[PDB]
Design a protein around this nucleic acid. Structure first.
Lengths: 287, 119, 165, 138
RNA sequence: GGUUGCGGCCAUAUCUACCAGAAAGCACCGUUUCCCGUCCGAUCAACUGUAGUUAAGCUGGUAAGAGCCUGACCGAGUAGUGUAGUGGGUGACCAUACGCGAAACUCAGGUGCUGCAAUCU
RNA sequence: GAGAACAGAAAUCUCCAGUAGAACAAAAGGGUAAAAGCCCCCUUGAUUUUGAUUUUCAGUGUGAAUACAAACCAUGAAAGU
RNA sequence: AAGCUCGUAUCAGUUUUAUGAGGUAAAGCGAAUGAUUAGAGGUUCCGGGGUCGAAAUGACCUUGACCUAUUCUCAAACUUUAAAUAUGUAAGAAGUCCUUGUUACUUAAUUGAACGUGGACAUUUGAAUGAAGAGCUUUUAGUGGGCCAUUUUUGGUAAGC
């Protein structure tokens, strides 16, 4: 509905799509970056629409690598089946994804060293550290930096026990004005949370039998199922202490196996799966 | 007509063709080496990693690595006598080289012991 | 198909004063209270004859709403203009949009409804596709869906039942 | 092209060395072609051009002087190398202050010389007809 | 097969117009009680767990088509240039010797696409 | 391509769908697009001490500028800067 | 000029292989920019000529006014593309390869960094070619008005300018 021509003069990247190969990457992966050296980084959780990804990656190489994992796409099995993306599964997949979940290094520089996960979980500052690694720096992603909100909460819940991300008071969920602080609020949401209080609301529906395994639902006034299913589960790498893997699953490696006919279309999605593999695809039928 | 510090540079310190902006974040990774031979090559994006003119095109060897982005140095030398001057350039402007015969140092030595047993 | 489509963007309401106060200081109020939302003034990037010899500042109000107050736009659609807008006759596309002229009048004056006088008779069309490429993060070109308003965004100001066809 | 001559080592008018047909040789040769005269030795021309004016940093007595070889000895061996170069060979040619050959002797080389190749003259690389313009000299 | 952070070249890197899309994954999409945010405006921002959708987005295929290719053949051993002459011509210029040696033009096969780590049906 | 009442070539106002043609005080050139441009938020690094560097093919002091060290701050959630 | 210090160390107005740097010659405007030819096609808009024409005349109309696929020729202070000449480096080799040891450095460190011990092989199987060694220290003359040519160019009708 217009033109083209000698439009011979672009282009841009694969972050024509949205990756901030912007001062973004090249300023987390730099410095640290030289002054030394030859290693350093420094991990970031960026949330999907359903699952909450906390891949604890660290820079370099052909292409940046994965110190370990995280991601609460299944903080369910581990004890927390409803509430995916509840801004305490930021606390959760916080410690629980990476942080303590991180890692071998990791659990090792921890589970005895560092650790303090949270040694709390009440509640306030810092919550920093004092020895030492894997000193992972935050690197949100793109998401906007709104005082109190998922991201900058995977932080505050993660390093509430573990890493040295360097997370500062200010934006941590709740508390401001006019000054600090503010102690209680965090203690709250952190402790999944304040959707209990929001589960006050009386009128039409909500969940289901997940509003029957809920409802109480910790209420009462919130201390029976909310901050309990939490408290307990909400202690997952500390209490509940597991891999970050955790149950690797690998049941993944099981589910293929599962595709359900036929080929495919593109067909290479058939065969693909079909066991792990079967024909060509990512082999002799793609990149 | 005047003699300012970027003078004549209009095309030397040029840019690109289409790669007309933003450091290849590779050209930014990579680690120096208090000894490895670097090859200057200025790039207007930056600007300490602009190498004041003459030292353009000239290849030398890293003597400093203040690796905090601060590239290294090297020197080279110049005309009448060669008085070797050193210049502290920046990490975004320099590049590796063709000391790539150490590949044939290897080839040599190794193939030469395999030559010992061979002989 | 035919799975999803049709909705009313926003009600871009705008008067074009041409002074400071206590004049614009009004088109505000008026707007504001026909609005419920507040009043985003308008700049004044620069100068010439008919006054308005000012730097980008003070000379109109923008306040424009949407969504639930949908009908709140056609809340004088049919009404104000007897449900008849730029009609006849070629390609059934009769100036996709609707004429206007300034508005206002009110130090005393009485509420509305119509009244407030002629006004910004548009906030209209331009075909379709998707939903949020006006997004943020991983942005994008809408799909290849629908007709340049016209053969589409006309047959949905034609089922508010009124004149233009 | 001066320093070239200097390093292909021939500092005299009607003088002349011998140099192996290797591209670091050849290349050089050409950078000079204008002003020298790439013959391309014959056998006899080597013999005579050896034995005759050709010899030593000082003259000739076989295995005698010619056995600061020590690869091998014999004026006829300096030849037996030089005129089929290769092997330790041409560190041999490091030896012979070279020439101090005669000015044309018999013939001159047609008309104008000091510019040429084909087209007549000099200044160029005969072969074959590389000897004769040497043949008359030593 | 997708999805996450990626390297790359980043037109050797997109357009543009049509299609088609199982499985999963992201998306669109529900919703304002809190944190938080509107030059107005829950669009954006962010904030909470499934009513409805593949329609877009995305992915890949079609055009051969617009882009750059990548290669080679005429184009081209030219155009230009390193050296040489006591070469040619009023002159302008030009030719010949050895040496380097293009670009545009067109003919073809590509199409943007490789591939890193971790996931995942 | 849309809606115009002092606007109506437009001076100025609000909607929508694509060549970097704009903007970076000032000359010209370089550069620069989630920016290096524009709107907001918060500061005073335009800081102390040195030294080394670079800039006449540079051995001369100067001005300017580059990377460090040690402090002391800003700002960001950060890595950074 | 005076001399040191020691004898293939390594030296070069030089080519050769590997690897960089160049935007001027050329080339280029149915490519950027900025110039300029020429008509074509608008199922195109603002006006000077006409028409059923003649005061919101719909509708076609003739010159300009911007597209759109074309045409013509250009650039010190324009351009994708881009030479030749000249211009950086590197070379066989004190070099790799192996073992570990030092703390102010930063990595979480069996992290490296920088340095050093013990250990295998060098005369070395593309570089060529040349050496009347090579290096080094002092000192103190004259000189600073230059002029020719070939090519490449600036001004200027030109110049034994």
């Amino acid at each position: 509905s217009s033109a083209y021509s000698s439009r011979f003069q672009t282009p841009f990247r694969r972050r024509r799509e949205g990756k901030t190969d912007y001062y973004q990457r090249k300023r987390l992966v730099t410095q640290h970056k030289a002054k030394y050296n030859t290693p350093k980084y420094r991990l970031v959780v960026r949330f999907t629409n359903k699952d909450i990804i906390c891949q604890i990656i660290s820079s370099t190489i052909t292409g940046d690598v994965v110190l370990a994992a995280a991601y609460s796409h299944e903080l369910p099995r581990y004890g927390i089946t409803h509430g995916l993306t509840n801004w305490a599964a930021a606390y959760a997949t916080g410690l629980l994804i990476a942080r303590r979940t991180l890692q071998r290094l990791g659990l090792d520089e921890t589970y005895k060293g560092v650790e303090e996960v949270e040694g709390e979980y009440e509640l306030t500052e810092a919550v920093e550290d004092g020895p030492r690694p894997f000193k992972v720096f935050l690197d949100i992603g793109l998401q906007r930096t709104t005082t109190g909100a998922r991201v900058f909460g995977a932080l505050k819940g993660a390093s509430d026990g573990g890493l040295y991300v360097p997370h500062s008071e200010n934006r941590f969920p709740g508390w401001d004005f006019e000054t600090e602080e503010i102690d209680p609020e965090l203690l709250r949401s952190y402790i999944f949370g304040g959707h209990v209080s929001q589960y006050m609301e009386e009128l039409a529906d909500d969940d289901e039998e997940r509003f029957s395994e809920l409802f109480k639902g910790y209420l009462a006034d919130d201390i029976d199922a909310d901050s309990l299913e939490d408290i307990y589960t909400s202690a997952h790498e500390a209490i509940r202490a597991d891999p970050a893997f955790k149950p690797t699953e690998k049941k993944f490696t099981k589910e293929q196996y599962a595709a359900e006919s036929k080929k495919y279309r593109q067909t290479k999605l058939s065969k693909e799966e079909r066991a792990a593999r079967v024909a060509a695809k990512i082999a002799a039928l793609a990149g | 007509k005047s003699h300012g510090y970027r003078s004549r540079t209009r095309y030397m310190f040029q840019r690109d063709f289409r790669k007309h902006g933003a450091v290849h974040l590779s050209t930014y990774l990579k680690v120096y080496k208090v000894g490895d031979i670097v090859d200057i090559k200025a790039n207007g994006s930056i600007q300490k990693g602009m190498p004041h003119k003459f030292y353009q095109g000239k290849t030398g060897v890293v003597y400093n690595v203040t690796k905090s982005s601060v590239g290294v140095i090297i020197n080279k030398m110049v005309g009448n006598r060669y008085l070797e001057k050193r210049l502290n350039l920046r990490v975004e402007h320099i590049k590796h080289s063709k000391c790539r015969q150490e590949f044939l140092e290897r080839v040599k030595a190794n193939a030469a012991k395999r030559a010992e047993a061979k002989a | 198909n035919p799975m999803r489509d049709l909705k009313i963007e926003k009600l871009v309401l705008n008067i074009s004063v041409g002074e400071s106060g206590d004049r614009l200081t009004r088109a505000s109020k008026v707007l504001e209270q026909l609005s419920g939302q507040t009043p985003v003034q308008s700049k004044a990037r620069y100068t010439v004859r008919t006054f308005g010899i000012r730097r980008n500042e003070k000379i109109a109000v923008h306040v424009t709403v949407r969504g639930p107050k949908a009908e709140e736009i056609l809340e004088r659609g049919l009404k104000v203009k007897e449900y008849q807008l730029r009609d006849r006759n070629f390609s059934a596309t009769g100036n996709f949009g609707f004429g206007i002229d300034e508005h206002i009048d009110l130090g005393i004056k009485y509420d509305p409804s119509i009244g407030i006088f002629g006004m910004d008779f548009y906030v209209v069309m331009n075909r379709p596709g998707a939903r949020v490429t006006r997004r943020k993060r991983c942005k994008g070109t809408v799909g290849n869906s629908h007709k340049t308003t016209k053969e589409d965004t006309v047959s949905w100001f034609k089922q508010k039942y009124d004149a233009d066809v | 092209p001066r320093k070239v001559l200097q390093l292909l080592r021939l500092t005299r008018i009607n003088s002349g060395t011998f140099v192996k047909v290797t591209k670091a040789t050849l290349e050089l040769l050409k950078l000079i072609e204008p002003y020298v005269a790439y013959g391309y030795p014959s056998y006899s021309t080597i013999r005579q051009l050896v034995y005759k004016r050709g010899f030593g940093k000082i003259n000739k007595q076989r295995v005698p002087l010619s056995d600061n070889a020590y690869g091998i000895l014999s004026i006829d061996d300096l030849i037996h190398e030089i005129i089929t170069v290769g092997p330790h060979f041409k560190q041999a040619n490091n030896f012979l202050w070279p020439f101090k050959l005669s000015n044309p002797s018999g013939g001159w080389g047609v008309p104008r010389k000091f510019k040429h190749f084909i087209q007549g003259g000099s200044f160029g690389n005969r072969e074959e007809f590389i000897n004769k313009l040497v043949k008359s000299m030593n």
